RNA sequence: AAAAAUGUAAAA
RNA sequence: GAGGGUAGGGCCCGUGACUGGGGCGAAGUCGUAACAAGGUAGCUGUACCGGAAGGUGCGGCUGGA
RNA sequence: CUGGUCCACCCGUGACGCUGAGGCGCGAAAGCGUGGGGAGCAAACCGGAUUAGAUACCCGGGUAGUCCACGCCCUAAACGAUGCGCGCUAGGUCUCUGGGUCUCCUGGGGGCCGAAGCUAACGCGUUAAGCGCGCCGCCUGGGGAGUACGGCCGCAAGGC
RNA sequence: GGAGGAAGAAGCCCUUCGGGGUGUAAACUCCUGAACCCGGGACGAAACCCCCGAGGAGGGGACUGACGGUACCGGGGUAAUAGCGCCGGCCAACUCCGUGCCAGCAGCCGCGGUAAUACGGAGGGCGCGAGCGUUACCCGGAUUCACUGGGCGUAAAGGGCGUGUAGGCGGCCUGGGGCGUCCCAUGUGAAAGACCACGGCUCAACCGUGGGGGAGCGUGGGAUACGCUCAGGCUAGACGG
RNA sequence: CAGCUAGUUGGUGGGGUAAUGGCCCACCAAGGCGACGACGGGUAGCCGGUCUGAGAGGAUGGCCGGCCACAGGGGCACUGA
């Protein structure tokens, strides 16, 4: 029961003898605005229905996000093949300055102070993927010394 | 003939870790020891020791990894998330004391060759000196 | 200067009860209590979810109009905020609140934020003796925001003070209602304030 | 490339030429209108565009487009060049200012009087 | 102070005058690579005792002639013809660059 | 391994 | 020794009957070479030739089977 | 007569190496020059047939050229459309060649399929398009145009 | 100008003809009071000059104001100029009529050829305010000359292949030097500026005052890890039998 | 723009200046410079600073401040610290 919000809803079609039927696709993201966030991209032959599918798909996936008084722990250069996005922890009072897509990502991630920028490709879909897997590589101080411990 | 023994060495680790090997060898050298010396001091290698490859002094770098992972494709965690050289034989990178980088906001380390030995990103700062930025690790 | 145009008309745009007046806005008619929908022929029509920028914009215009001050000065202060350290966000609202004429409202001397400007303009207000007419003038920590001698016994003034009996106001402010004077204790901590606006968004916007 | 490649060769500086040969990039150039004729548009359009060649005082000779609803420029009118091409007319890379010199403004116009040079009227 | 350079005698075909090359390396202003460039200087040797290839030192001195404001100091090592080559060979290749 | 040319110019 | 004068070269700009190709164009004329074995697989260096696209020769490449 | 290349013995040298602006040399085919040769083939060219037309597709005849020498030209889808060198990173399969008490092991080369990994996808994947260092080459929207001018080379066509 | 003020004038626009919009906006009530009027009215000026001492030190006396009868202070005092751009998407702001590939807009994609939110007018809205907007030029977005921070099988791009000159790069160990580089000290980096702090002019702009470290360079001292350099040894690269 | 140079490079002696110096003169010796871009052409006064920019970089030099150069074009020397 986290906070839900979509990104974009395109309208792809199909060539075929006679006419050109369609199939809508909607990108949606969820989060309680504190560490818990999930991204899902639902495809369906109808705008609303697609959002509905995006719903379950989003509430399905999810990832923990080690906060820090509203900011991210550290910075990362996460390249998702095509696109390239980098985040960086800012001092409280800064603001969620990021691309249109990553905005609603970290916004629902309980982030308020972050520095990001998209490089290479800027395809909404890909960029999204990136931002997620990015948070998926995040490592807290605890996480670090934990694996580095191995005692 | 190679160029920078360190360059290919860090690569041994990289390529090995990617496939999760027990350990890998590499031609024995003064500097490489220092590398592993700190690469163990901060804790990225299980250790090392000079071995033999047909009368050829090598160095067995014993790799460290993470716990087994649940879910699709049980990929064991990587202790050495990423390690890349900075001061290349092409571009000799010399940094000052109050210039030394902060690898991923402390989470990382900057192995560099000080004018008084070899120290970490923080160790070099504490002693109050600068040197050639060998590489970073995190 | 300030947009003299109809004001209880903007309350409808922000969709938030804004006290740009005095008595009437507290009455059963902030002009939005009557018409909870934005102005124009339309407004009474199903609208659409604005864009990120769009929301940030509307959100900003909420704060701005509240202090009925030129966007010029409004922006100039946003910068002034970023200029210094601290939580630039709340800091902005902070200096916004430090504005002389503004304190004159949060001290009761005037019934409206706009009427405050008027009074302060005609030097009806004093500070440590000087008849500061400048609606600007950032009141530093610790000042005697009193009422000028000539301005003491004034009809409109009295009405404002008489009604301003008791009634806690400004935790970071003191009020000597007896002699018609107030003081600026400390800088209003973010928590103390409580405006219908979201600073974080207003911040993001001016980063473009 | 490599490091040495940069050490020797080096990154080539961009450098871009202007879309408008109007001398000192001067805000506007003055000239005398030589030809005042209407030319037909390009590919997707067709609406006889009122254009006028203007032999600048700066020794040039270019074609400019007259906006607004009509005008009053003959074979010897003087005028200013705004500088701004028209993607519907091949070659026309200069607008022509309104209300300036022999070039009158637009009659009846209400909105956007600025661009079309029309001193605000009075309703009363 | 009186600037002093450690260069090599690359030309001794003048009267009481000797040319000297001086290589100075430094970080590239932008690319930080240890690049190496040089320049030729005309020294004053009233004794002519310094011969070709002789690595010597040169000090910023009183103006002697037009393009000459430096004087010799002392030898660093005699046999250094190999370096002279690097200079000479560079010259040679030049002749094959024109038309 | 298959004799046989060509359809100008206005909207998703 | 300013400059002036005489003779002769170098570079740059403008201009010029005529001429070369290029770009551009809701429409023309002549064919149809290319994309499907495009109805001779196509492309290609070079050569020759023809209203034109192009054909043919020598070799080569599949981005042909 | 002569270059390059591989395996075994670990015998000698003792960092002598990698790369390579310009330059030097090689460089299919067609083409040019003097001389030689000419079976077949064969642009051009002549004729037949098809077609509206047919300077073409097919058929008949046919020259230069194709071949030799010596000299010049220096281009190509010169194609793996993948610069050179050293190092690390599953393996299964068959083939060329070399070593060895040999249902098998070991070195160099060629081809398919695939771990990890890279990739826009295709696809690459110890013959990398993987991970990493060193050096040269080169690209920075299409057309204009590989043209125009200048410069250099060439007998020319034309090339850089 | 401020406070109030109708379930909400008039006109104007829309309309499923019920009503909706302009809009508390106005009208009107009440309070203030820029402009304007009267009176007073600066700082900026102290010193050279006079006197005792010794013509000095020290100390005491005296002249001068362009701006100005200006700013500023006290009193008397009238509701008192609002404009420009935009409203298809980018981009915040929707409807009516007219027009009919015309007129005309256009920064990019495009719009207009009978029902245009895109031309023009209107109603209304959005932004901004003594300004708004256009043109021009510079950085930015442009990680589109890529040190940070690109790329080259088919998208623009491996030279046709080889040889080698300069240049660039450099295997493991030990030794001296300390050129690169690293650290300290110091000279330096002037003022104006930028930043932080306090203060001046009613605030600000403007300005005074103080504090900070600065790249680089000069000198002195220090270190030796890798680069460099000379020197000795090895065989894993290359070469040779 | 790929090769450039006769006061050209250097030396002895001298002239000249406040002073070094082909700055200039006579004599002598062939040198001097250049792909680390000489020579040519184009453009432009330089910096402190200013503009933009996450920074690096890019752009720039109006005002004020510092140095430079010119005072219609062009040459000359007198007076004087
Ligand atoms: Mg990419
Ligand atoms: Mg394992
Ligand atoms: Mg160990
Ligand atoms: Mg209320
Ligand atoms: Mg203003
Ligand atoms: Mg209050
Ligand atoms: Mg209140
Ligand atoms: Mg008063
Ligand atoms: Mg005010
Ligand atoms: Mg209180
Ligand atoms: Mg508290
Ligand atoms: Mg409040
Ligand atoms: Mg900003
Ligand atoms: Mg901004
Ligand atoms: Mg007319
Ligand atoms: Mg007239
Ligand atoms: Mg030297
Ligand atoms: Mg002399
Ligand atoms: Mg002399
Ligand atoms: Mg057949
Ligand atoms: Mg036809
Ligand atoms: Mg058609
Ligand atoms: Mg003469
Ligand atoms: Mg003369
Ligand atoms: Mg002449
Ligand atoms: Mg002449
Ligand atoms: Mg001519
Ligand atoms: Mg012509
Ligand atoms: Mg002719
Ligand atoms: Mg063509
Ligand atoms: Mg045509
Ligand atoms: Mg016709
Ligand atoms: Mg045609
Ligand atoms: Mg064909
Ligand atoms: Mg085909
Ligand atoms: Mg094909
Ligand atoms: Mg052919
Ligand atoms: Mg071939
Ligand atoms: Mg098949
Ligand atoms: Mg042989
Ligand atoms: Mg043989
Ligand atoms: Mg064997
Ligand atoms: Mg043996
Ligand atoms: Mg041996
Ligand atoms: Mg041996
Ligand atoms: Mg030996
Ligand atoms: Mg080679
Ligand atoms: Mg050569
Ligand atoms: Mg040859
Ligand atoms: Mg041939
Ligand atoms: Mg022949
Ligand atoms: Mg011929
Ligand atoms: Mg015959
Ligand atoms: Mg015949
Ligand atoms: Mg025939
Ligand atoms: Mg035949
Ligand atoms: Mg012929
Ligand atoms: Mg033969
Ligand atoms: Mg050939
Ligand atoms: Mg090619
Ligand atoms: Mg080799
Ligand atoms: Mg075998
Ligand atoms: Mg073997
Ligand atoms: Mg094999
Ligand atoms: Mg495969
Ligand atoms: Mg895989
Ligand atoms: Mg993929
Ligand atoms: Mg795949
Ligand atoms: Mg393999
Ligand atoms: Mg293998
Ligand atoms: Mg294999
Ligand atoms: Mg082009
Ligand atoms: Mg060609
Ligand atoms: Mg030519
Ligand atoms: Mg070529
Ligand atoms: Mg009111
Ligand atoms: Mg008063
Ligand atoms: Mg007075
Ligand atoms: Mg006085
Ligand atoms: Mg006195
Ligand atoms: Mg005097
Ligand atoms: Mg006396
Ligand atoms: Mg006396
Ligand atoms: Mg005196
Ligand atoms: Mg007066
Ligand atoms: Mg007064
Ligand atoms: Mg008064
Ligand atoms: Mg009154
Ligand atoms: Mg009133
Ligand atoms: Mg009024
Ligand atoms: Mg009144
Ligand atoms: Mg606008
Ligand atoms: Mg509109
Ligand atoms: Mg409109
Ligand atoms: Mg909108
Ligand atoms: Mg009409
Ligand atoms: Mg318009
Ligand atoms: Mg278009
Ligand atoms: Mg209509
Ligand atoms: Mg229509
Ligand atoms: Mg309209
Ligand atoms: Mg529009
Ligand atoms: Mg428009
Ligand atoms: Mg309007
Ligand atoms: Mg730009
Ligand atoms: Mg840039
Ligand atoms: Mg580009
Ligand atoms: Mg690019
Ligand atoms: Mg560009
Ligand atoms: Mg790119
Ligand atoms: Mg290509
Ligand atoms: Mg090749
Ligand atoms: Mg060499
Ligand atoms: Mg040593
Ligand atoms: Mg010693
Ligand atoms: Mg020592
Ligand atoms: Mg240093
Ligand atoms: Mg340094
Ligand atoms: Mg210091
Ligand atoms: Mg210093
Ligand atoms: Mg200092
Ligand atoms: Mg400085
Ligand atoms: Mg100072
Ligand atoms: Mg300073
Ligand atoms: Mg401070
Ligand atoms: Mg203050
Ligand atoms: Mg102050
Ligand atoms: Mg202040
Ligand atoms: Mg103050
Ligand atoms: Mg203050
Ligand atoms: Mg100051
Ligand atoms: Mg200061
Ligand atoms: Mg301080
Ligand atoms: Mg330094
Ligand atoms: Mg002479
Ligand atoms: Mg002499
Ligand atoms: Mg003399
Ligand atoms: Mg003199
Ligand atoms: Mg002399
Ligand atoms: Mg001489
Ligand atoms: Mg001579
Ligand atoms: Mg140059
Ligand atoms: Mg000039
Ligand atoms: Mg100039
Ligand atoms: Mg940037
Ligand atoms: Mg700045
Ligand atoms: Mg001026
Ligand atoms: Mg004059
Ligand atoms: Mg003169
Ligand atoms: Mg003169
Ligand atoms: Mg004088
Ligand atoms: Zn209200």
Swiss-Prot record, chain A:
Domain-related comment: The N-terminal domain interacts with the head of the 30S subunit; the C-terminal domain interacts with the body and contacts protein S4. The interaction surface between S4 and S5 is involved in control of translational fidelity.
Gene Ontology BP, a term: translation
A single Gene Ontology CC term: small ribosomal subunit
Subunit structure: Part of the 30S ribosomal subunit. Contacts proteins S4 and S8.
Pfam families according to UniProt: Ribosomal_S5, Ribosomal_S5_C
Record-level Gene Ontology MF annotations: rRNA binding; structural constituent of ribosome
Gene3D superfamilies reported for this sequence: 3.30.160.20, 3.30.230.10
Annotated function: With S4 and S12 plays an important role in translational accuracy. Located at the back of the 30S subunit body where it stabilizes the conformation of the head with respect to the body.
Superkingdom, natural source: Bacteria
Name under which the protein is recorded: Small ribosomal subunit protein uS5
NCBIfam families assigned to the protein according to its UniProt record, in alphabetical order: rpsE_bact
Family recorded in the similarity comment: Belongs to the universal ribosomal protein uS5 family.
Record keywords, A-Z: Ribonucleoprotein, Ribosomal protein, RNA-binding, rRNA-binding
Domain named S5 DRBM: residues: 3-66
InterPro entries: Ribosomal_Su5_D2-typ_SF, Ribosomal_uS5, Ribosomal_uS5_bac-type, Ribosomal_uS5_C, Ribosomal_uS5_N, Ribosomal_uS5_N_CS, Ribsml_uS5_D2-typ_fold_subgr
Curated annotation (Swiss-Prot), chain C:
Protein name: Small ribosomal subunit protein uS4
Binding, Zn(2+): 8, 11, 25, 30
Names of required cofactors: Zn(2+)
HAMAP family in UniProt: Ribosomal_uS4_B
InterPro entries in the cross-refs: Ribosomal_uS4, Ribosomal_uS4_bac-type, Ribosomal_uS4_CS, Ribosomal_uS4_N, S4_RNA-bd, S4_RNA-bd_sf
UniProt keyword annotation of Zinc present: yes
Record-annotated S4 RNA-binding domain positions: 99-161
Source organism (scientific name): Thermus thermophilus (strain ATCC BAA-163 / DSM 7039 / HB27)
Keywords, in A-Z order: Metal-binding, Ribonucleoprotein, Ribosomal protein, RNA-binding, rRNA-binding, Zinc, Zinc-finger
Domain of life: Bacteria
Zinc finger residue ranges, C4-type: 8-30
Cofactor note: Binds 1 zinc ion per subunit.
Gene Ontology molecular-function annotations: rRNA binding; structural constituent of ribosome; zinc ion binding
GO BP terms, alphabetized: ribosomal small subunit biogenesis; translation
Function description: One of the primary rRNA binding proteins, it binds directly to 16S rRNA where it helps nucleate assembly of the body and platform of the 30S subunit.
GO cellular component: small ribosomal subunit
Presence of keyword Zinc: yes
Family affiliation: Belongs to the universal ribosomal protein uS4 family.
Oligomer and partners: Part of the 30S ribosomal subunit. Contacts protein S5. The interaction surface between S4 and S5 is involved in control of translational fidelity.
Curated annotation (Swiss-Prot), chain D:
GO biological process: translation
Modified residues (3-methylthioaspartic acid): 88
Region (Disordered) residue spans: 105-124
Record-level Gene Ontology MF annotations: rRNA binding; structural constituent of ribosome; tRNA binding
Record keywords, A-Z: Methylation, Ribonucleoprotein, Ribosomal protein, RNA-binding, rRNA-binding, tRNA-binding
Pfam family, one: Ribosom_S12_S23
Keyword Ubl conjugation on entry: no
Compositionally biased residues, Basic residues: 108-119
GO CC terms in record: small ribosomal subunit
Domain of life the protein comes from: Bacteria
Cross-referenced SUPFAM superfamilies: Nucleic acid-binding proteins (SSF50249)
Functional description taken from the UniProt entry: With S4 and S5 plays an important role in translational accuracy.
Assembly and interaction partners: Part of the 30S ribosomal subunit. Contacts proteins S8 and S17. May interact with IF1 in the 30S initiation complex.
Family membership noted in the UniProt record: Belongs to the universal ribosomal protein uS12 family.
Protein name: Small ribosomal subunit protein uS12
Source species taxonomy: Bacteria, Thermotogati, Deinococcota, Deinococci, Thermales
Swiss-Prot record, chain E:
A Gene Ontology biological process term: translation
Residue ranges that the Swiss-Prot or TrEMBL entry lists as coiled coil: none
Top-level taxon: Bacteria
Pfam families: Ribosomal_S17
PROSITE patterns (alphabetical): RIBOSOMAL_S17 (PS00056)
Protein name, as recorded: Small ribosomal subunit protein uS17
Keywords for this protein: Ribonucleoprotein, Ribosomal protein, RNA-binding, rRNA-binding
GO cellular component: cytosolic small ribosomal subunit
MF (Gene Ontology): rRNA binding; structural constituent of ribosome
Protein's job: One of the primary rRNA binding proteins, it binds specifically to the 5'-end of 16S ribosomal RNA.
Record note on quaternary structure: Part of the 30S ribosomal subunit.
Family statement: Belongs to the universal ribosomal protein uS17 family.
Ubl conjugation is among the record's keywords: no
């Amino acid at each position: 029961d986290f906070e839900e919000k979509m990104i974009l809803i395109r309208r792809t079609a199909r060539m075929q003898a006679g006419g050109r039927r369609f199939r809508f696709g909607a990108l949606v993201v969820v989060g309680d605005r504190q560490g818990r966030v999930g991204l899902g991209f639902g495809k369906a032959p109808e705008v609303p229905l697609a959002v509905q599918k995006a719903g379950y798909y989003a509430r399905r996936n999810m990832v923990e996000v080690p906060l820090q008084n509203g900011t991210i722990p550290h910075e990362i250069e996460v390249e998702f093949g095509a696109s390239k996005i980098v985040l960086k922890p800012a001092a409280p009072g800064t603001g969620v300055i990021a691309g249109a897509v990553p905005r609603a990502i970290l916004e629902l991630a309980g982030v308020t102070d972050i520095l990001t920028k998209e490089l290479g490709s800027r395809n909404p879909i890909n960029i999204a993927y990136a931002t997620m897997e990015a948070l998926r590589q995040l490592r807290t101080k605890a996480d670090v010394e934990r694996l580095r411990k191995g005692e | 003939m190679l160029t920078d023994p360190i360059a290919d060495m860090l690569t041994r680790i990289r390529n090995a870790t990617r496939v999760y090997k027990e350990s890998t060898d590499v031609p024995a050298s003064r500097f490489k020891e220092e590398i592993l010396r700190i690469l163990a001091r901060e804790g990225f290698i299980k250790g090392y020791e000079r071995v033999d490859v047909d009368g050829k002094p090598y160095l067995r770098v014993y790799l460290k990894y993470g716990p087994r992972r649940q879910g699709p494709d049980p990929r064991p965690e990587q202790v050495i998330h990423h390690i890349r050289r900075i001061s290349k034989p092409g571009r000799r990178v010399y940094v000052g004391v109050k210039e030394i980088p902060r690898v991923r906001r402390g989470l990382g380390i900057a192995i560099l060759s000080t004018s008084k030995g070899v120290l970490t990103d923080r160790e070099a700062r504490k002693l109050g000196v600068g040197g050639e930025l060998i590489c970073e690790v995190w | 200067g300030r947009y003299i145009g109809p004001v209880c008309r903007l309350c409808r745009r922000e969709g938030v009860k804004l006290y740009l007046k005095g008595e009437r806005c507290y009455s059963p008619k902030c002009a939005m209590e009557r018409r909870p929908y934005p102005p124009g022929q339309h407004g009474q029509k199903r609208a659409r979810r604005p864009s990120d920028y769009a929301v940030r914009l509307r959100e900003k215009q909420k704060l701005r109009r509240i202090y009925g001050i030129s966007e010029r000065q409004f922006r100039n202060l946003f910068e002034e905020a970023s200029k210094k350290k601290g939580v630039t966000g709340s800091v902005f609202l902070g200096l916004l609140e430090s504005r002389l004429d503004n304190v004159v409202y949060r001290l009761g001397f005037a019934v409206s934020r706009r009427q405050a400007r008027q009074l302060v303009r005609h030097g009806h207000i004093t500070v440590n003796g000087r008849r500061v007419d400048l609606p600007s003038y950032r009141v530093r920590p610790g000042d005697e925001i009193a009422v000028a001698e000539k301005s003491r016994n004034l009809e409109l003034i009295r009405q404002n003070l008489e009604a301003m009996k008791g009634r806690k106001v400004g935790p970071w402010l003191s009020l000597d209602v007896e002699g018609m004077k107030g003081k600026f204790l400390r800088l209003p901590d973010r928590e103390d304030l409580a405006l219908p606006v979201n600073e974080q968004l207003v911040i993001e916007f001016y980063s473009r | 490339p490599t490091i040495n490649q940069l050490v020797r060769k080096g990154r080539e500086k961009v450098r871009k030429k202007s879309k408008v040969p109007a001398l000192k990039g001067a805000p506007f150039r003055r000239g005398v209108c030589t030809v005042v004729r209407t030319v037909t548009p390009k590919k997707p359009n067709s609406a006889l565009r009122k254009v006028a060649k203007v032999r600048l005082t700066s020794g040039y000779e270019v074609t400019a487009y007259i906006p607004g609803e009509g005008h009053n420029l003959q074979e010897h009118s003087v005028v200013l060049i705004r500088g701004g091409r028209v993607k519907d007319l091949p070659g026309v890379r200069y607008h022509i200012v309104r209300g300036v010199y022999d070039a009158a403004g637009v009659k009846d116009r209400k909105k956007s009087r600025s661009k079309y040079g029309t001193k605000k009227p009075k309703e009363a | 102070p009186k600037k002093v350079l450690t260069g090599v005698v690359v030309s001794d075909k003048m009267q009481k005058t000797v040319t000297v090359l001086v290589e100075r390396q430094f970080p590239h202003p932008l690319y930080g690579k240890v690049i190496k460039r040089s320049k030729k200087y005309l020294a004053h040797d009233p004794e002519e005792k310094y011969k070709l290839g002789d690595v010597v030192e040169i000090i910023e001195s009183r103006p002697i002639s037009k393009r000459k404001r430096f004087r010799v100091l002392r030898l660093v090592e005699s046999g250094r013809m190999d370096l002279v080559e690097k200079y000479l060979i560079r010259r040679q290749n030049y002749q094959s660059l024109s038309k």
